[PDB]
């Protein structure tokens, strides 16, 4: 449920400020306070997000997510307030995944080959369909929502790193191409130069970011779980 | 009036296709996700049931590039040697892939 | 205890000793059962049956 506390409920026009303290912002991340700040910066709406929500009711498109149960794990959209990674806007060349049902949404994530993409609609521009068009409606005037406007695709576990030599990064990309003879073009980004292609395909493979531009995918990887007492992890 | 001719060409010893099957080329590939107790919070007794198709431990359920691969736990490491400071043993899930690259 | 390990192959197929030398300069040794169409997996390349 709650990492530290249950997020406060304030009856909407309030700009939640920065806190220098490290252990104070974590329960604010529990409150989904940061994603509301993303709206004020790019969507330009003062909609408080997740009253009573926290991290105990947020659901993702997968039917069962083990990572959602372990709220200690850190989400890509939650790594933006802490400063490791950043989510950006969506380009016209970028398109939706027809996987989930976009009902009553304003902000949903999509990790990509390059980075993390967040999409926005207007406050009152209700998202009642999977399309890009946002539809006006008066039913979402109230800001109370059990993560209805916040649906997150993917099951991503985030953590700090120690970077790798540029040569080590180069080994993965070449080997990844070898592992995937058929995959040639991904998201328009070149993976292997090939001939003419068909456009429509939902593609879902495991990936990993090592701090480099090209994402690394795998099919025969072996993960390893070790936990150590780190002052950041307290 | 009309007619009909039938021409023969060869004599040989063949036999009819009673059945038909294809044989791909199997390669045995396997991964291993290595949890330890209180970190994956798996039970003291390994669950006798295994969903060989979903595998919710790693990205819930999607397409498995193996054809009905098996599943299971493993023996346990416990202590500072494996780092997650539990003296209790550890459960490890394993996969098996049959793959035909070329 | 005195412990024995066993395996019932119940067959006999010719095999050879093979040294591999990747063009980068790396070398890998392995015992492939070249009598059968076995596929030993290493690096990028795979060898298989012989005569």
């Amino acid at each position: 449920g709650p990492i530290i506390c249950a997020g406060p409920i304030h009856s909407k026009s309030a700009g939640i400020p920065h806190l220098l303290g490290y252990s104070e912002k974590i329960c604010q991340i529990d409150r989904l306070i940061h994603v509301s700040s993303w709206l004020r910066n790019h969507s330009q709406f003062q909609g408080y997000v997740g009253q009573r929500g926290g991290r105990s009711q947020v659901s993702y498109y997968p039917a069962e997510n083990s990572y959602s149960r372990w709220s200690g794990l850190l989400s890509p959209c939650d790594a933006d307030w802490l400063g490791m990674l950043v989510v950006k806007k969506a380009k016209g060349s970028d398109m939706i995944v027809p996987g989930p049902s976009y009902k009553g949404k304003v902000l949903f994530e999509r990790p990509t080959f390059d980075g993390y993409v967040g999409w926005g609609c207007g406050s009152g521009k209700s998202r009642t369909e999977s399309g890009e068009l946002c539809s006006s409606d008066s039913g979402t005037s109230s800001g109370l929502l059990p993560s209805d406007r916040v649906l997150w695709i993917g099951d991503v576990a985030c953590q700090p790193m120690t970077p790798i030599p540029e040569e080590t990064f180069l080994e993965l990309k070449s080997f990844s191409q070898s592992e995937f003879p058929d995959i040639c073009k991904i998201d328009g980004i070149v993976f292997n130069q090939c001939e003419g292609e068909s456009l429509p395909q939902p593609f879902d493979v495991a990936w990993m970011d090592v701090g480099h531009s090209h994402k690394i995918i795998m099919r025969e990887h072996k993960t390893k779980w070790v936990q150590e007492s780190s002052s950041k992890d307290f | 009036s009309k007619c009909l001719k039938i021409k023969v060409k060869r004599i040989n010893l063949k036999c009819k296709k009673s059945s038909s099957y294809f044989v791909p080329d199997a390669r045995s590939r396997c991964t291993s996700v290595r949890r330890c107790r209180w970190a994956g919070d798996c039970q003291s007794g390994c669950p006798p049931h295994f969903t060989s198709n979903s595998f919710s431990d790693d990205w819930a359920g999607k397409m498995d590039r193996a054809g009905l691969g098996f599943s299971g736990c493993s023996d346990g490491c416990g202590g500072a040697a494996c780092g997650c400071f539990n003296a209790a043993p550890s459960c490890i899930f394993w996969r098996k892939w049959v793959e035909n690259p070329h | 205890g005195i412990i024995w390990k066993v395996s019932p192959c119940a067959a006999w197929v010719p095999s050879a000793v093979i040294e591999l030398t990747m063009p980068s300069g790396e070398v890998r040794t392995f015992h492939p059962m070249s009598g059968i169409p076995t596929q030993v997996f290493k690096g990028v390349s795979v060898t298989y049956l012989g005569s």
């Binding site: - | - | 063009p23 492939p32 990028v44 390349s45 012989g50």
Partner: peptide
């Protein structure tokens, strides 16, 4: 007749003289 199948490799990419020195003995 050992053979190998090829996957997705990592293939990499002036003056020179031969200047033989000697010859040994074999035929057949």
């Amino acid at each position: 007749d050992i053979t190998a199948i090829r996957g997705s490799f990592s293939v990499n990419y002036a003056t020179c003289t031969g200047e033989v020195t000697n010859v040994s003995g074999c035929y057949s």
